[PDB]
Structures are given as structure tokens and as C-alpha cells.
Amino acid sequence: SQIRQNYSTEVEAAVNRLVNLYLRASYTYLSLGFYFDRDDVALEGVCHFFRELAEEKREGAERLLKMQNQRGGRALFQDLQKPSQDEWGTTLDAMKAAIVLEKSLNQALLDLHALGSAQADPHLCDFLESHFLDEEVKLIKKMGDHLTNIQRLVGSQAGLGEYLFERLTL
Amino acid sequence: SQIRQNYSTEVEAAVNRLVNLYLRASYTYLSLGFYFDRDDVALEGVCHFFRELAEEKREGAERLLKMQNQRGGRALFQDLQKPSQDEWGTTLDAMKAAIVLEKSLNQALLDLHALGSAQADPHLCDFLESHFLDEEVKLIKKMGDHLTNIQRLVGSQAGLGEYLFERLTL
Amino acid sequence: SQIRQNYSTEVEAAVNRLVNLYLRASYTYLSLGFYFDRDDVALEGVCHFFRELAEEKREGAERLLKMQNQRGGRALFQDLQKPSQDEWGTTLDAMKAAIVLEKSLNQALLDLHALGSAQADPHLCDFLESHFLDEEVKLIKKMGDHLTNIQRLVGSQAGLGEYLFERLTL
Amino acid sequence: SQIRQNYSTEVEAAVNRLVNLYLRASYTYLSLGFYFDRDDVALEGVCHFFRELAEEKREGAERLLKMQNQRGGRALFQDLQKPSQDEWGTTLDAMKAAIVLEKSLNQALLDLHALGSAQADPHLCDFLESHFLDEEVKLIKKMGDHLTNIQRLVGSQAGLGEYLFERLTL
8 A cells, every 4th residue: 555654564463353352342342231231130320331332442443443544554354253141140240241351452452552662663552542541441440440349239138239339320 | 984994893892992901001000109109108209100100001092092083983981990909019019010011001902903904904003003012112121120120129128129219210 | 031022932033133134234334434445445425425324234233132122032142244355346346235235134124024924023013114124225225326326427437437426426 | 951851962963854854845835835826737726735734844843843942952954955846747746746755754753753762762752643643644644545536537537537636625
């Protein structure tokens, strides 16, 4: 491409697997969203938390793809994996799977940043910094807050903690 | 009647028993409404839920009767039955009786739709679809949500779940 | 599920494959969107057409899943397939693949409607009618309009037709 | 200077040659601007594209010089070179020379960023990132879009593509 500059073939490919992970994640959030809208869960606020997330992750991957073109990279598509479970258990378990999820997402950006500097690509590095690493770490903090509060509430009487959580946090 | 068209005598009659069930239901909702406003219950939000319902069901039966005339059918009136119980127990029990209630109501429309197509009456079929089947299924989902949440809250300590339910859902 | 009524196990499963096709389609639209934003295509209006579509299809599948829960069905997830090609050729070829795409989507609803009536499920039938079959057929008309206009423009001088198309239709 | 900190003599000098290139570029844009306003070209939109650019590049160099002082560096001035040609040919050729131009500009920032990290100067690195590398890559994408569209239009009938381009892109 006549507009590409200092954008390594390694970076291009690695970005695209990052693209795939974000989209996998959005789709994983969808599944979770509608799991807590199963009548035998029925917690609107949990659903509403995860609704906003399905929108969030997709917005990032589009952001990336905008940049992909800006650097003159090629989008490469492969299948987007199904979520690993059908039932997510209690909210405690659901938020736990959410947290493994965001961990890996930050991991991916981290490893892509590090690849970026070992390949001497400074634009790519700042792009990640501006719109992404920051969203992640704000959101991770928030998730953590939730999880610790969740556990401190379940220990006593299971359903009660769960209900007040949905109603009164979200 | 010179305005009636393709409206079988069977349909006419079966509509009217549907009319009767909706009105029975509105009146059943009234009884429930004022049961939870008994001082030895006293849960405004439960009362308020059921107040809106007594208005809802009557509104449907009027809708039907509007259509009865539109098709040139005859309203036929019989006694409207009293609710089957005087005390509705805990909110758990009340919402359960509400749910048997809406089930039968959807049943009635379903059987009337099916009668409609075995009698080749397409207007009637769409009428049910537009203003009714849809309200039912939205409302059924909602009831279900409530019931599952109710049960998950009672198990621990009876009154507490019941209070937070009324306050914090409705 | 305690809220489910007259919703066959066949319907449940068939809906879910419809869910999968809509989501496959949204993701197929994404790939197309960013293909025409490749610098060696660069047609904002084509991109903008397909951007709105990626949002449209996902909106439908969410609609469906709303209904899935409303009927007390279970979401079932499998992998969501990658688009079948990496380059979409000229706009002529791209819009052609778009059109195969919408055809199959209407097909799926059609077959699901017909399954619906062979299984005597009238709610499901009207649901498809209200929010879906209609969007499809409006959108198909529109696509068709585009394609015929596209072909009538390319025959003469290839790039010129393509540019005026993007600029002056979209 | 009593306010300077961790700002190498190499960086200072290299910044100033970057200053010179931006200013050279603004002045190169001026020449191009007025070339397409030659009556025997006369394409307002091309002129208007390049008018905005002459303002853009100068705005950057001022930005830099602001930072020069902020770090306690010394502005160093040398002659600012004339554009390399008097006639820019067709718009195809003009945009091509524009694109060589922006390439070198991003090159300069890249090499200055890399000099920055081999000299361990982290403020300088982020400064480039915030107000510059980003403008470049947005603008490069845009130029590219133009050029590809330009070529796809000229091949057929030369003047026609050129006119519709000026009118209907810009």
C-alpha cells in the first residue's frame, strides 16, 4: 500500500489477533448479558452492565480497525469463538469470568505495546495508550470493586446479597 | 346485521367468553390490589402493581368489545365470577396465583387465534396479534422476573425479602 | 422454565440458528465496511452504507434474543463464521455478495415463519412480521436499486461509474 | 538557560531542522495553492485544500517553537527552501508530490522520536505523539484516499475525472 509507513508485517498480524479478541469479548458479553436476562436469573442491572460492555468492546475493535487502515494494514478475518460456558452460575461466578476476560484483554494490549517497541513503532504505542490501556484500567478497577463487594455480601445469605447488588449498585 | 362480514357464530361466542375472562381478571386484580392494602399486609408497591393491572385488563376487554361491534357481533353478558380465594398468603403465593391467571389469559387468546384460522378469519387473527398477545408476553416475562426474585429472597428471612421486594422493585 | 408457553423445542433451536446468521451477517458487514475503507478502495459512502448495516443486523439479533427470553427459550451459542472472502472486488461484486446475504436472511425468516405455523405458534409468526420481514423487504428493494444502477454505470468506463455511485447515491 | 532540563544539544539542533522542514512545507503548500489558482488550472477546491494545509503546517512549526522555548531551547534559523518545481502537472502529479512531502514529514518526526528515546528524553517523545504524529497519519490517510480516486478517474477521460474530483470531493 502506498500510504503505509514503518508498520511491520508482525505488528499487522498481531493487531489482527487483538481485533479478534475484542470481538470475541463483545460477543462473550452478549452471551452474558442475555444469560442474566434468563427468567431464572432476571437481574436487569447485571444485564444492563453487560449490555453497555458489549457495546464498549465492539467500539474498541472498530477503533483499532480505523487505525489498521490509517497505517495501511489489511484487516484479516477468522472465525470469532463462542463463549466458553452456557451457564455462568451465580453473579459471583459471572463477574469472575468477566475479570479473567479483561485481564487477558489488557495482556493483549501490553504484549502488543512491547512488540511495538521491540519493532521500533512509536505511533502504534501511543495509539494504544490514548484510547485503550486507560479504558481498561478504569474498567478493571470498577469490576474489582464490584467483585469484592459481591463476595462480602454472599457469605451471609446468598440471594439477598445478589439482589441488593443488582438493585443498589447497578 | 348488514355490516358483519366473514364472522362465524362460533367465533362470536368464543370471543364473548374471552371477554368474560378478561373482566373476571380485572376484578380478580382488584381483589388482590385491596388484599395487599389490608393493614396486616400493607405493601403499597404490591398494591400499586395490581392497581395498574385492574386498569390494564379492563382496557383490553373494551378493546375487544370495540372490535365486537366492528365485526357486527353481539356482546353477550353472564355473571362475572368472584376471585377464588380471600387471602392470598405471602407475596410469593400472590404473584403465583397472578401467574396462573396470565397463563390462562394467554391460553384463551391462543385457542381463539387457532379457532380463528380453523374458521378461516384473518382479520380476527391479526387483531389479537396487534393489541394483545404482545402485551401478555411482555407482562408474563415481567411477572416471571418478579417471582424468581421473590423466591430467591424469601428462603433466608421471610419478612425482609418481602419488604425489600415491594420497596425496591416496585 | 416457568414462564414458557407453546414454544416448541424445534422452534427454540431454529431461532438460535437464525440468531447465529444475523450475527454472522453483522460481522460480514463489518468486514465489507472496512474493505471499502482500504486505501486502494477508499469510498467513504460505500463504507458508510455498510457501517449502518453492521449496526442494523446486530440490532435485529438482540431483538430476537429479547423475544427468546420473552418466550422462556435458551440462548445457545456456537462459533460465528468469518466472511467467505477477503477482497470483495469492484463495488459491483460487493453489492452482489450483499444481495446473496440478504436473500438468505429473508429465507431464514421465511422458513422459520413456516416452521412456526406447522408447529401452530402464532405469537412467533407475528413477531417476525412486526420487526423483521418488513425491514428486509424495504432494504432488499434498496439494494436492488443500487445494483441495477451500479451495472448501468460500469459498462461505459469502470472507475467513473464507481466514483459517482459512492458520491452521488450514498 | 536556567529553566532547561534533560534536553540534549543534539535534540535541540534536530528539532530545529524539523522546524525548518515544516516551514518549508507550509511554503511548498502556498506555491501549490496558487498553482491551482493559475487560470490555466483553475480548480478552487484543489486550491482550497492546499490553502488549509499552508495554514496547518505553519501551525505545527509554531507549536514546536512553543515547545522549544518550554524546554529552554534556542530557535536557530537558516534559509527556508523554495519548492522544487514551478508547474505541478495534472492534479494526479500534484497530489503525488504532496504525498512525498507528508511521508518525509512523518519520517522526520519518527527519526526525532527515536533520537529522543536513544537520548532518554521522555517529555519530547510524548509531545510529538500528542499534537503531531496523529495529525499526520489522519491527513496521510486522507491524501491516499484522494490519490487512489484520482487515478481511478483519469484513466478514462482526463479533464472529466479532474473536474469531478475538485467539485465533488473538495
